[PDB]
Amino acid sequence: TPQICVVGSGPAGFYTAQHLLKHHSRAHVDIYEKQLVPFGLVRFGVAPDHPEVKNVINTFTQTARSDRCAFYGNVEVGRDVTVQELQDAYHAVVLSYGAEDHQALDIPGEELPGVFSARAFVGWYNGLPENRELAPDLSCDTAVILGQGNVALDVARILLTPPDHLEKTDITEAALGALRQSRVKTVWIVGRRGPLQVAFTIKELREMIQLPGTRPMLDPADFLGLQDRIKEAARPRKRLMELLLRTATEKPGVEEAARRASASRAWGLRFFRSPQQVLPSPDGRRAAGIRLAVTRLEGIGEATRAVPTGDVEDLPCGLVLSSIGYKSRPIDPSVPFDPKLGVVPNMEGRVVDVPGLYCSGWVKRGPTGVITTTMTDSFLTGQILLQDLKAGHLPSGPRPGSAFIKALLDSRGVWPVSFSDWEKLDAEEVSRGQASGKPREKLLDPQEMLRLLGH
Numbered sequence: 001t002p003q004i005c006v007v008g009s010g011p012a013g014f015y016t017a018q019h020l021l022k023h024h025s026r027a028h029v030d031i032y033e034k035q036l037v038p039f040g041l042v043r044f045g046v047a048p049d050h051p052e053v054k055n056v057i058n059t060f061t062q063t064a065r066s067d068r069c070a071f072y073g074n075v076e077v078g079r080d081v082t083v084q085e086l087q088d089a090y091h092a093v094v095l096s097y098g099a100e101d102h103q104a105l106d107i108p109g110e111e112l113p114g115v116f117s118a119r120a121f122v123g124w125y126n127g128l129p130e131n132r133e134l135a136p137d138l139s140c141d142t143a144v145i146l147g148q149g150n151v152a153l154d155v156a157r158i159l160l161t162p163p164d165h166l167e168k169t170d171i172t173e174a175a176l177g178a179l180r181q182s183r184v185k186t187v188w189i190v191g192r193r194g195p196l197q198v199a200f201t202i203k204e205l206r207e208m209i210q211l212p213g214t215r216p217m218l219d220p221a222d223f224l225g226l227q228d229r230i231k232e233a234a235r236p237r238k239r240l241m242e243l244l245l246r247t248a249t250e251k252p253g254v255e256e257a258a259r260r261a262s263a264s265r266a267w268g269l270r271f272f273r274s275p276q277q278v279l280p281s282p283d284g285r286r287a288a289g290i291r292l293a294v295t296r297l298e299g300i301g302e303a304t305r306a307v308p309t310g311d312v313e314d315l316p317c318g319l320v321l322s323s324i325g326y327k328s329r330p331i332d333p334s335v336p337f338d339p340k341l342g343v344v345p346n347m348e349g350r351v352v353d354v355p356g357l358y359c360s361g362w363v364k365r366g367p368t369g370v371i372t373t374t375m376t377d378s379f380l381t382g383q384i385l386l387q388d389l390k391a392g393h394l395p396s397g398p399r400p401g402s403a404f405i406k407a408l409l410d411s412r413g414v415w416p417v418s419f420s421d422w423e424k425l426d427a428e429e430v431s432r433g434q435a436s437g438k439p440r441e442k443l444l445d446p447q448e449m450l451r452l453l454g455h
């Protein structure tokens, strides 16, 4: 009876577990999670207006309800239980704990009230307990987001959607309340490079262009000569660039021109600008602008980089969201960690020089794929692990699994959240959603969550 444990209950943990249970009829999989609840970024990252994307929870739930899978929330691996303890109890351990850090801007002014990582702002409207008191000040009229990735688009879309259109989503009631009072009418999404280097994808770009109550602000000068350079581009890329190009250069029909003229909000893309400094209000109590270094591109293809021209531009704004990526964080002394790539060093999921220890998802590859990328990547890890298990490369003999770990946790005063505990809070969140017409109303207070969890 093979005992495997998974550290992290987001898409990598669940798809790794799912692959292991499907391809090995005896193996048992225990999934550990630091938060009180499961699902990682499916619950706390994916936007409330992308409910479609969260449907993978239904298959995670079937896996968690099966006889050979168990969930242990409220357990911080590296703190409540060490990786070495897990290695001693299981035949194999998979690190699937994501990239829990935001990359900082590393610029002056970054400490002013009104500056946040997009991550934190997302965690706030998605009910991540640690961001429940973020209390972003939306009394300003312009927000600036740095980074032109899908995350940037999510934050801009939430800031500009007519609040009534988010009423029936699972957005927190607190964030929706704040959004109803927001004075933000303009959002600029600023990239260091040009149009050809944007990192967002077409579904999200179209959602922005078509967002009711808004008009797009693209400078055609940013796109001169684009059709020409995208003629040998890959189909998806080319389609995206053509959608951007049209939005920037086609004069709209009479109806769309009217709709754009009556719009109360606007969003735009700014290119060739890198963040140099957040500017304070005269009294230093808030952000009042962002100083951007003008840049120009040098290099060919993917090797192209922005290099400063020496010119600067100041752009007034009261909200600055850095949406420039992530880094995983080390978890425990027994786990190698590369501070540079911000990943656990590994060879196709096998952690370097640590027999029995594997990894999957963002902590394995770096923070850049969508859920399906994470899924097929977790499957690759799952294949190598199971081939190692079958081959007899992991310790021979019994391995106690949770029997041993719970006894440690029992003594240490740590009471894990089982999946059935979670099911109780899920029912409560869902029922609370019934009265208000939402999918659920997430509990944010850890104390109240613990009570509703049966703790």
Ligand SMILES: Cc1cc2nc3c(=O)[nH]c(=O)nc-3n(C[C@H](O)[C@H](O)[C@H](O)COP(=O)(O)OP(=O)(O)OC[C@H]3O[C@@H](n4cnc5c(N)ncnc54)[C@H](O)[C@@H]3O)c2cc1C
Pocket: 007, 008, 009, 010, 011, 012, 013, 032, 033, 034, 035, 038, 039, 040, 041, 042, 045, 046, 047, 050, 053, 075, 076, 077, 078, 096, 097, 098, 099, 100, 122, 151, 154, 331, 360, 361, 362, 363, 369, 370, 371, 372, 374
């Ligand atoms: C804002 C945002 C929006 C996104 N939107 C989409 C989208 O619309 N569509 C899409 O396909 N993809 C989207 N993605 C991509 C998707 O979030 C990632 O592909 C996926 O979540 C990565 O999976 P993961 O399991 O590696 O990491 P995560 O989902 O982060 O999960 C890691 C898990 O490990 C837990 N953990 C961390 N430390 C510990 C510890 N010490 N002990 C135990 N457990 C621990 C974390 O709490 C978490 O639950 C988005 C990402 C972000 C940031």
Ligand SMILES: NC(=O)c1ccc[n+]([C@@H]2O[C@H](COP(=O)([O-])OP(=O)(O)OC[C@@H]3O[C@@H](n4cnc5c(N)ncnc54)[C@H](OP(=O)(O)O)[C@@H]3O)[C@@H](O)[C@H]2O)c1
Pocket: 105, 146, 147, 148, 149, 150, 151, 152, 154, 191, 192, 193, 197, 198, 199, 200, 201, 204, 274, 275, 323, 324, 325, 326, 367, 368, 369, 370
């Ligand atoms: N629906 C979906 O499919 C979906 C939805 C949401 C999120 N996601 C995913 O989640 C993953 C991570 O997302 P992400 O948006 O945070 O990052 P990302 O996709 O990698 O893009 C963000 C980056 O910020 C920029 N950047 C980095 N450092 C910078 C700096 N110091 N100053 C200015 N700009 C800087 C990079 O610009 P440069 O390119 O020029 O260097 C790039 O735009 C992605 O794979 C994204 O697709 C997917």
